[PDB]
Amino acid sequence: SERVLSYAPAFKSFLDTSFFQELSRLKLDTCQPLTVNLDLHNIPKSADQVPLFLTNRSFEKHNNKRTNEVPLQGSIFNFNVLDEFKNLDKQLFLHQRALECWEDGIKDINKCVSFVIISFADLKKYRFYYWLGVPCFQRPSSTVLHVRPEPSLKGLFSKCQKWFDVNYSKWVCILDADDEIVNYDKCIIRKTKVLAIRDTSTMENVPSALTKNFLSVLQYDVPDLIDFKLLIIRQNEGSFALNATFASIDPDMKVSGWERNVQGKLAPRVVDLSSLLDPLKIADQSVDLNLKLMKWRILPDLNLDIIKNTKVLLLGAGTLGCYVSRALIAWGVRKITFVDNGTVSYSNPVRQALYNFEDCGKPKAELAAASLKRIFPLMDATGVKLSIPMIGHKLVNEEAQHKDFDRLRALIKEHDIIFLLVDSRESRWLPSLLSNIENKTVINAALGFDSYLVMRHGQLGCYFCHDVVAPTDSLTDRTLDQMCTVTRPGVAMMASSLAVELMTSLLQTKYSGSETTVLGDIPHQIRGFLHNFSILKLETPAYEHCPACSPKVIEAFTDLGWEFVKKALEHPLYLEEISGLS
């Protein structure tokens, strides 16, 4: 029948985002007073103790309890040094608190109840470290308590329940000589012998650990009282009466009270609210949803990941490079690398869509990358100042130009799709080969005053298989990929987007027995004309004597290497001997 009284944690903590926000606002503008409003009626069957709710309001003075709520005073100790937090005497700290509670408990037994929070806020990473502590002292530590049940007294319990509901500041009450509930009074309990406590535990037959606190005070006030009646009053059905007696197993005061973290261990609790409060992450979120939402409502069969995870390499941060990098981004592409040897000129900003008047004179390639990051910070934008040697062009400073060759491979390599966005035919050679020899997909964008050309090579022909423009062609036609960068503006815009939309269609699985995907066709070549507003799709087979993808040529580069390039670059006729046009 008998037993020793065991307890349960007084409270469970619930810190709302608003709490942590307020916490931060204050760190950017010691000890801090808090105040909660306990609701000992609204307790989920699922929990074991009164839930402690902390929000940005707990910090304030003017809180506003509702009928039947019990206001509870508390505090928070914030630390700037994460080490200080970690290296604190968790034990000593709770003990220093328990001493303050004990000091007030001997003045008003109803004031030995309080909570405390230790914390460290990592405002940059939005990580928050905190530990809730409820001062629970037992003095003397030797004194335990033997108890025996007593058949319920719903009459007495209810009586006490109403009393505590009304007296929202009291945690203990007793009976006077007329058997009526009255405030705790040492000399009166000494005789009446019945102590009633407002339990914050639901644990069946196990009172809150705050019980130890009051008992410590009781003992101090009535050394002799060794036998009595304990009533654990709960604002529900669990209220139970007990036949107490004070024992003593061999002034020593033990203190407990730290809250077990999520995992169940006795250590701090950490919460990462970056996904919620980090604008930069909330930003990254939306960019994502735009596509997921787009897919979901109009094209569930769209593969977004592939596009997102493609590492694009843009050769040229000029007019085309900008509009292209612009369209890629908007598709989700997160890895983009710019390769341009020049710098931003006065006449660039209005045409090349990633520059401002202020960045004139500065290195172009590395600035475009910087510009994507302003638009979208998470972007993996990189700029490399390297030079692509042209065919039929006296090698200048062979050493350094050689490095530019090796360095250009390292790049055509670490990437998935290569965008060839240069001015002239002569500057497409070296890179197209390197990209073929590296088994990479190449998309080409060429500009003409009126027209443009977009195409791919992953067998289909490459740019250099067959000529594009004939001699007997139009004047405004022959300006195609002819070092003609300044054209009717709109040309680069279309050429760009089509070049990107082709890369995204081509990146989707093709329907067996057909040349299409969920996004439409996957043409080989696209040709546009502004004076008539038209587009044409043409396909062309690999040519046997092409100076770029011909077996003999690839062979040559494979066998000799740079010696071949160097020679080819300075002497174009040479390539024609190798290919077989001769």
Added chain:
Amino acid sequence: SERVLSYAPAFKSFLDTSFFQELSRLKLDTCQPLTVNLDLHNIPKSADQVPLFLTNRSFEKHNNKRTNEVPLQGSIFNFNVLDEFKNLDKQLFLHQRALECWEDGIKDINKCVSFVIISFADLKKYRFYYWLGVPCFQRPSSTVLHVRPEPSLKGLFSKCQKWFDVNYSKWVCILDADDEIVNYDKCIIRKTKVLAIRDTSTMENVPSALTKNFLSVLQYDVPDLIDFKLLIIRQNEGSFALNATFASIDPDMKVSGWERNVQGKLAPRVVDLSSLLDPLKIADQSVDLNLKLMKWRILPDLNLDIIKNTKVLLLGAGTLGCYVSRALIAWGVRKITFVDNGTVSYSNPVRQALYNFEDCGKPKAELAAASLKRIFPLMDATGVKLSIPMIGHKLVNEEAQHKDFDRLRALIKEHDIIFLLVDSRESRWLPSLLSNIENKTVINAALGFDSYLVMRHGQLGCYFCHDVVAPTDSLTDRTLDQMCTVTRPGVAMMASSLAVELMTSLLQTKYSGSETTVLGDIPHQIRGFLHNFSILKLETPAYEHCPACSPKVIEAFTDLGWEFVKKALEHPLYLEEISGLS
């Protein structure tokens, strides 16, 4: 035979851009010492005096004359207050100088020669105010000089010429008792009676005014010497000998020396070097040349001014508004006005081409304008936060929404071409009408997941004449202008550029007997599709019962006005009664 000696200005000033630059560098980091190197041999037949060349080097100590050059010490007085400059005693200042020269002249006759510059630099406007002053004193003022020619003595002249060439620091020489050229010596000239001066004037028979300076010293050194021989030595053929005699027409010292400005008046000289040094103007220059150069080499028959001088009004600073304003700029368009009621959202920057992560939350319309100005500072970019009410949409707050209506007219009015770049059909009505009622050209851009539509109205039909998409159409087709802003990115890019290239072709004079200009066609409607990479041009006649351009409708708006709109907006069926679809 006789006459009175007249003079000519000692020097002519030439301030090189480098001078003014150095001048500035110093103002951003009193009196300043200058030093020039006169070249009295290299004198253009066209000039009247030795040219004084000032550059950024004049400021320096280590200048480096060339053989036969005469170093001349000078100074500059700079002013920060333009008023101080203006309100200075030009007369007193030159006189205070002449006094210093006179002080050194009596110590070494060869040191009474110097120049001075007063200036005010307007570094922001690149305007420079300066006045060159050459201290020329005549003392006493009463003493003039009667002179009579003397048959050349090329022997004597040459003798003196060599002497001055060698003695680059001397301005005067004389003959000793052995009839040999020697440095000036008061007691020696008192007897030898021949004074030779290094003339800096080419003026036939008129010596430099610096002559007065030496004569002033001569008089002071030899009060008695009343008759003598003056030799005006020029480093060429004009050297002439004179029979002098000192007169006196009734110590008073008059001072002259200020340089006549470009116009010939005796005031400061002002030079505006903004077109040269203003990066912002040099910038504006290039943007200009790009097109002039483009026209010149590929299309001399292109009218650029028209495009440049068009005041474009963009309704919507979303995805379309950005790419469009982007293409316009690059064509030269300098007046662009953005009209958008919303603000920049997290998911915007990657799609809407004129925004950065940093400007999220801020008012969209006014920010796009700000963004064009960063790209190109001279742009006349304006942003207006106004709202375009939708058809079939419960009027909300009639008053303010009314203003938004009146204010939208003021704009569709002060502009030349109107770009309709909104999300839905419902938001194109009010503006399309207003733009028709205002006789303005309207270009429309509609977005669909896969497609887009661009068209114009200046009789051809308007957007609302005939339906665009049918019900029995494709799923990915019916998303056209269906509040579908998030589509395959490239759509807005093409839709935009084509919309701008159409406006530029349509802005060029049409070849009589044909529907084309120097830039190509001028379609009514352009339709594009991404899944197949195609474009179509369709034309459609004005419809009799169109709810926007139908005679009955225009009539209605004309007759009633806002009362009509308000009613039409809230009740679409109404419009159909008016038009006649009923």
